[PDB]
């Protein structure tokens, strides 16, 4: 990532504001999920496809589900491994297909569940937490050393009933602790179960925030702020403190005051969650919102699309916002759009915007052995990212490219 | 006597877009009387609209359906956006 | 075989004397739902609120054709053309 | 520090244009007119291959996983062919000849030059045209991508320019020297070959006056120069990678004399002259430890630290 | 922005004291929402900002500093969607948009 | 259940229908280029009335475009319509 | 020694600092010259965002360099 090192400066602004791309995907799509690096964009589809695009030319590199383990029903969620090599994908076919891009169209392993699925969230590339329909516990799917037995440990202490606290529907693993996973019931309580990765699970937090059907829980990537999306028209960002012993408090609430509408999806910025981005629900909701998570106010509104938007992904490496269409199925994409500069034409050019008063010097009327290294890749970019941990590039299907010229 | 008008409040916006220009009084009486038209045109339509639905309050939701009716095309979308952005800042602070 | 142009005057008087609706119902009620697709998705149309749109579109086109035919006549001919319709709309303010 | 290991190819025959070792460091493709000599370095095995091309193929690009070879020639053909499974794709887009091309570090967008002052871009799987990059005033000779990330595209050309481009949106991004205009001097020595480094933070250039410089483009100025103790060849350049601390630059003279410069100094330590002494050199490449050479007659020469 | 003078709290220039008065002594409806005059002052300021911007632009393009009604007609009628909002209205002392139909030019 | 985006029902405003509509408007000879111009005119009229018809319903939080909302859309553009009430 | 803290839209300042000064010490000097609070300031050098606790020597800031300042105006 060396464009931005000399792009030049003036690209750090922490959101994109112009929509630049539009994946004209005919088969409508629910969930979108970028690669961990800015390379690819997985597109969870309605008719059972999971299209995988290469983000550089807006056209796919494969559509997995040909050889083994096609999601027959609609797919609700897709996450990736920590590197970007595997892919867990939970659909409504009661399966949770873990893919391997090395053998692209062939699923690695799956598992039959108790019903359709809401989501999946990958903690280590094997273990994955999957939300079974209307079950008061989440069955963590740990892909063991043997590929046939995934111990679906109940994510619940043995006797703490949550009847009246609700039913587990979401679970987002904590980034900077990785052993606590916060899970959301359906009547406002939020259970916090710490995996030992034995199976003991301490209930580090059980508390009702409001008597609402929790739709979605997200964590900042520094684990500092946690926001909840109730079934009341409110977003509740908290302040998360854990060493274990965990504790939250109400920082701010977010609501549609005028239109008084529901929130579909919510997402946090890269570093510490200085920005929240939410998608409203009703008619005439044509635009994602932004929020200064400290001041609490609606900073900006990303007026791109034409009709409601469902899923939000924010890959900060590309600084992009993928946002699927609720109606058309098309996948709008915002992007920090740099303009060119003619100061790149010559090594002594300069682009000023004021008629500058050059002051006269005198002579307008008068007529290398330094430290050179080629071995270390750069450790950071202008966003402070974890570059130089080499991402899993896609293996282009070189078993089937040779026919791929002829008839797909 | 004191006969109120929007003389200053138009001037304070002239100093925000074009901070070097001024305005002739005959073209201030126009702006004084342009806003008094758009006021009585928006609050008019936003009071047939709170009465067809048998409400008895002009909320801020009538004023944005009234603006999405009167103001055409791209003045609708912008004046909604600068509408909601200025009521959110009111409630929060 | 009549003279060309006299079945017309036998057809003008016939329609002007009656009050039924001249566009077919179902090819219109489908057009309204096609156009209502843009502004909201999957609307229902309380089925007297399409009759309220034939009777206000038919009575608009007919008042436009009365204003078109006055312009064609004014250009010293008896055949309306699209350079008349665009004039009648430009004079009323519509375009 | 560096010496000769083996010479395995005989010299003469057809026109020898390009030599490229694949990044796995075991499979070498010797580019002659429309035939590809493949040379496995293990037991010094041989392998012959032939393409669907007609004219002198001036370019060669290896796959980053050593599973494809593409090439473009002056007849506007841009062919993509498998190493064992033959011809798979073809692009056909340029309005002037092509001299060199390069793969992405992902292997998905091969960059591609024309000679009519325009670089064009192709996604291989979609086989269509992405972004045009027409910011130059000559036949653009060498367009190189760094080995590690695939962020940027450096364009050196026959008008004497060192211009860095974008690969995402395709604007020119930095210039390191002047043109026909904007100095008017005879200091518009054309550039023959621009090569990035292993990490990709420093650039290497070879101008037509046989003077090699190493640019620190992030700052805008130069930190190394290399001279020999006017050219009319588009001779190859590389920077060898010994496991010692000092990795040496290598270029070929007008004749078949190849000296190797200590890059941590500004001088040489060593020169290779015992081979290629008849024929003049057009290209070189390397690998972790297995560097080849070439000239108009294709004598490949392994060397080692 | 501030805490006094309710327009300050929304960060506007148009008053919300005057508007909220004029929405109750104008008999538009019975009870005026407390959010309502704010949103109404936001729309009014935006239009007064947009019409004073295109007026001022056409005042420097005719070399004059201040704005006379001839500039306000040129700001409205040359625009595509401010002319449509102000379609039926007539700006006093405000000229015409210069146009001549094509067949009137010689040839 | 089923999912159709409509295409080209403006060809339902038929060439004989624009003729009958013209007859009540009292015209004798209709040039053949009218029939793609009236369709242009009607499709513009229907948009502005439906966009105000919808905006009224969408305010009242409904999914049926009732007959009074159509009438208020017409009453706003100075076409008042008298057989549907209020 | 002298620096430029040349801001994003195009104009420059002239400060007097030491290389041993903290970035917050430099962020104090901008606030003395602009009133802009130091918490809303990001100082950018060779593309790298500099931290409040670090010094100018740490980032190889030399005489007459151009630093980049990108304010975040609050709200609304």
Description:
The structure is cut from a larger assembly and holds seven protein chains of seven kinds. Chain A is mostly beta strands and 408 residues long. Chain A has helices at residues 3-6, 401-404, and strands spanning 18-23, 32-34, 40-44, 50-54, 59-64, 75-80, 86-91, 96-100, 107-109, 117-122, 128-132, 139-143, 150-154, 170-173, 180-184, 190-195, 201-205, 216-219, 225-229, 235-239, 241-242, 246-247, 250-254, 263-268, 275-280, 288-292, 298-302, 309-315, 320-325, 331-335. By secondary structure, chain B is mainly α. Chain B is 71% helix and 2% strand. In chain B, helix 2 packs across helix 3 (62-70) and helix 3 (62-70) runs antiparallel to helix 4 (74-92). Chain D has 305 residues and is mainly β. Chain D has no helices and 28 strands. In chain D, a hairpin with a 5-residue loop joins strand 15 (152-156) and strand 16 (162-166). Chain D has one domain. The chains are: A mainly beta (408), B mainly alpha (93), C mainly alpha (95), D mainly beta (305), E mainly alpha (107), F mainly alpha (86), G alpha+beta (76). The interface between B and E is large, with 60 and 59 residues. It is classed as transferase/structural protein/dna. Keywords: Complex, methyltransferase, chromatin, epigenetics, TRANSFERASE-STRUCTURAL PROTEIN-DNA complex. Structural basis of COMPASS eCM recognition of the H2Bub nucleosome. Chain A: Swd1.
List the helices and strands and how they pair.
The structure is cut from a larger assembly and holds 7 protein chains of 7 kinds.
Chain A: H1 3-6, E1 18-23, E2 32-34, E3 40-44, E4 50-54, E5 59-64, E6 75-80, E7 86-91, E8 96-100, E9 107-109, E10 117-122, E11 128-132, E12 139-143, E13 150-154, E14 170-173, E15 180-184, E16 190-195, E17 201-205, E18 216-219, E19 225-229, E20 235-239, E21 241-242, E22 246-247, E23 250-254, E24 263-268, E25 275-280, E26 288-292, E27 298-302, E28 309-315, E29 320-325, E30 331-335, H2 401-404
Antiparallel strand pairs in A: 1-30, 2-3, 3-4, 4-5, 6-7, 7-8, 8-9, 10-11, 11-12, 12-13, 14-15, 15-16, 16-17, 18-19, 19-20, 20-23, 21-22, 24-25, 25-26, 26-27, 28-29, 29-30
Chain D: E1 3-7, E2 16-21, E3 27-32, E4 35-40, E5 45-50, E6 61-62, E7 68-72, E8 78-82, E9 86-90, E10 101-102, E11 109-113, E12 119-123, E13 128-133, E14 142-144, E15 152-156, E16 162-166, E17 172-175, E18 191-196, E19 203-207, E20 212-216, E21 221-226, E22 237-239, E23 249-251, E24 258-261, E25 268-272, E26 284-285, E27 292-293, E28 301-304
Antiparallel strand pairs in D: 1-28, 2-3, 3-4, 4-5, 6-7, 7-8, 8-9, 10-11, 11-12, 12-13, 14-15, 15-16, 16-17, 18-19, 19-20, 20-21, 22-23, 23-24, 24-25, 26-27
Chain G: E1 2-3, E2 15-16, H1 23-34, E3 43-45, E4 48-50, E5 68-69
Antiparallel strand pairs in G: 1-2, 3-4, 3-5
């Amino acid at each position: 990532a060396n464009l931005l090192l000399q792009d030049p400066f003036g690209v750090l602004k922490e959101y994109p504001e112009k929509l630049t791309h539009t994946l004209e995907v005919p088969v409508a799509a629910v969930c979108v999920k970028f690669s961990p690096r800015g390379d690819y964009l997985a597109v969870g589809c309605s008719n059972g496809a999971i299209i995988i695009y290469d983000m550089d030319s807006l056209k796919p590199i494969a559509m997995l589900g040909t050889h083994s383990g096609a999601h027959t029903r609609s797919v609700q969620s897709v996450c990736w491994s920590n590197d970007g090599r595997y892919l867990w994908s939970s659909g409504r076919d009661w399966y949770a297909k873990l893919w391997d891009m090395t053998q692209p169209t062939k699923c690695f392993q799956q598992y039959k569940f108790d019903g359709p699925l809401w989501s999946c969230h990958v903690v280590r590339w094997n273990v994955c937490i999957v939300t079974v329909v209307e079950e008061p516990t989440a069955y963590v799917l740990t892909l063991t050393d043997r590929q046939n037995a995934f111990h679906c440990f109940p994510l619940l202490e043995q006797d703490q009933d949550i009847s009246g606290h609700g039913y587990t529907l979401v679970a987002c693993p904590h980034p900077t602790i990785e052993s606590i996973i916060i899970t959301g019931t359906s009547k406002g309580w939020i259970n916090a179960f710490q995996l030992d990765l034995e199976d003991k699970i301490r209930c580090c937090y059980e508390e009702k925030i409001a008597n609402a059907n929790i739709k979605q829980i997200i964590i900042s990537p520094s684990g500092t702020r946690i926001a909840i999306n109730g079934s009341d028209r409110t977003i509740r960002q908290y302040q998360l403190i854990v060493e274990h012993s965990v504790s939250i408090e109400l920082e701010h609430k977010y609501q549609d005051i005028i239109n008084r509408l529901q929130w579909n999806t919510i997402f946090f910025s890269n570093h510490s969650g200085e920005y929240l981005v939410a998608s409203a629900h009703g008619s005439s909701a044509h635009d994602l919102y932004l929020w200064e998570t400290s001041s609490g106010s609606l900073v900006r509104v990303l007026e791109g699309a034409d009709e409601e938007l469902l899923d939000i992904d924010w890959n900060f490496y590309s600084m992009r916002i993928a946002s699927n269409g609720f109606e058309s199925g098309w996948v709008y994409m915002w992007s920090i759009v740099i303009p060119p500069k003619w100061s790149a034409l010559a090594p002594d050019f300069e682009e000023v915007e004021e008629n500058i008063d050059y002051q006269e010097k005198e002579n307008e009327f008068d007529i290398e052995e330094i430290a050179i290294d080629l071995c270390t890749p750069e450790k950071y970019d202008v966003r402070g990212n974890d570059i130089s941990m080499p991402s899993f590039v896609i293996p282009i299907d070189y078993e089937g490219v040779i026919i791929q010229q002829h008839w797909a | 006597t004191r006969k109120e008008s929007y003389a200053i409040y138009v001037y304070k916006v002239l100093k925000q877009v074009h901070p070097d220009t001024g305005i002739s009084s005959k073209a201030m009486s126009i702006m004084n009387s342009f806003v008094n038209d758009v006021f009585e045109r928006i609050a008019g339509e936003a009071s047939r609209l709170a009465h067809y639905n048998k409400r008895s309050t002009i909320t801020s939701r009538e004023i944005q359906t009234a603006v999405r009716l009167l103001l055409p095309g791209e003045l609708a979308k912008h004046a909604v956006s600068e509408g909601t952005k200025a009521v959110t800042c009111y409630t929060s602070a | 075989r009549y003279r060309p142009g006299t079945v017309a005057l036998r057809e003008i008087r016939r329609y002007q004397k009656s009050t039924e609706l001249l566009i077919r119902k179902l090819p219109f009620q489908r057009l309204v739902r096609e156009i209502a697709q843009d502004f909201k998705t999957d609307l229902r149309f309380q089925s007297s609120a399409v009759m309220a749109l034939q009777e206000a579109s038919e009575a608009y086109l007919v008042g436009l054709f009365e204003d078109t035919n006055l312009c064609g006549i004014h250009a010293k001919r008896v055949t309306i053309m699209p350079k008349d319709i665009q004039l009648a709309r430009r004079i009323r303010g519509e375009r | 520090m560096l010496q000769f290991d083996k010479q395995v190819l005989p010299a003469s025959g057809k026109i020898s244009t390009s030599c490229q070792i694949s990044p796995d460091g075991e499979l070498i493709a010797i580019c002659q007119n429309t035939d590809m000599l493949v040379y496995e370095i293990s037991s010094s095995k041989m392998m012959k291959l032939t393409t669907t091309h007609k004219e002198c193929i001036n370019c060669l690009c290896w796959s980053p996983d050593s599973k494809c070879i593409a090439s473009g020639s002056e007849d506007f053909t841009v062919e993509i062919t498998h190493i064992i499974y033959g011809r798979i794709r073809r692009l056909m887009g340029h309005t002037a000849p092509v001299i060199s091309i390069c793969y992405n570090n992902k292997g998905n967008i091969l960059c591609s030059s024309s000679m009519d002052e325009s670089i064009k871009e192709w996604h291989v799987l979609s086989g269509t045209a992405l972004k045009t990059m027409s910011a130059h005033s000559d036949a653009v000779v060498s367009i190189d991508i760094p080995k590690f990330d695939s962020s940027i595209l450096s364009s050196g050309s026959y008008d004497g320019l060192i211009r860095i481009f974008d690969t995402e949106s395709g604007h020119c991004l930095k210039t390191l020297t002047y043109d026909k205009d904007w100095i008017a001097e005879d200091g518009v020595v054309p550039i023959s070959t621009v090569k990035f480094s292993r990490n990709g933070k420093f650039l290497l250039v070879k101008s037509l006056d046989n003077v090699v410089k190493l640019w620190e483009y992030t700052r805008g100025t130069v930190v190394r120069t290399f001279l020999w103790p006017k050219l009319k060849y588009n001779c190859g350049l590389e920077l060898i990678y010994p496991q010692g601390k000092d990795p040496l630059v290598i270029s070929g003279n007008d004749s078949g004399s190849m000296c190797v410069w200590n890059v941590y100094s500004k001088n040489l330590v060593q020169k290779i002259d015992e081979k290629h002494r008849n024929s003049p050199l057009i290209s070189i490449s390397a690998s972790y430890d297995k560097v080849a050479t070439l000239s108009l007659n294709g004598e490949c020469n392994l060397f080692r630290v | 922005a501030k805490a006094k003078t309710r327009s300050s709290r929304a960060g506007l220039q148009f008053p919300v004291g005057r508007v909220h008065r004029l929405l109750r002594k104008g008999n538009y409806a019975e009870r005026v929402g407390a959010g309502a005059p704010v949103y109404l002052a936001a729309v009014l300021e935006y239009l007064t900002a947009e019409i004073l911007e295109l007026a001022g632009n056409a005042a420097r393009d005719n070399k004059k500093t201040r704005i006379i009604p001839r500039h306000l007609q040129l700001a409205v009628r040359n625009d595509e969607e401010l002319n449509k909002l102000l379609g039926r209205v007539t700006i006093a002392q405000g000229g015409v948009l210069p146009n001549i139909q094509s067949v009137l030019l010689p040839k | 259940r089923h999912r159709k985006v409509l295409r080209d029902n403006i060809q339902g405003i038929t060439k004989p229908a624009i003729r009958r509509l013209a007859r009540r408007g009292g015209v004798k000879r209709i040039s053949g280029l009218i029939y793609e111009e009236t369709r242009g005119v009607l499709k513009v009229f229907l948009e502005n009335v439906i966009r105000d018809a919808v905006t009224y319903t969408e305010h009242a939080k409904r999914k049926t475009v009732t007959a009074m909302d159509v009438v208020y859309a017409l009453k706003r553009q100075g076409r008042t319509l008298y057989g549907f009430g209020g | 020694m002298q620096i430029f803290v040349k801001t994003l839209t195009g104009k420059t300042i002239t400060l007097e600092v030491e290389p041993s000064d903290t970035i917050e010490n430099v962020k104090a000097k901008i606030q003395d010259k602009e009133g802009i609070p130091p918490d809303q300031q990001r100082l950018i050098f060779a593309g790298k965002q500099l931290e409040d606790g670090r010094t100018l020597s740490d980032y190889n800031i030399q005489k007459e360099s151009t630093l980049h300042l990108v304010l975040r105006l609050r709200g609304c």
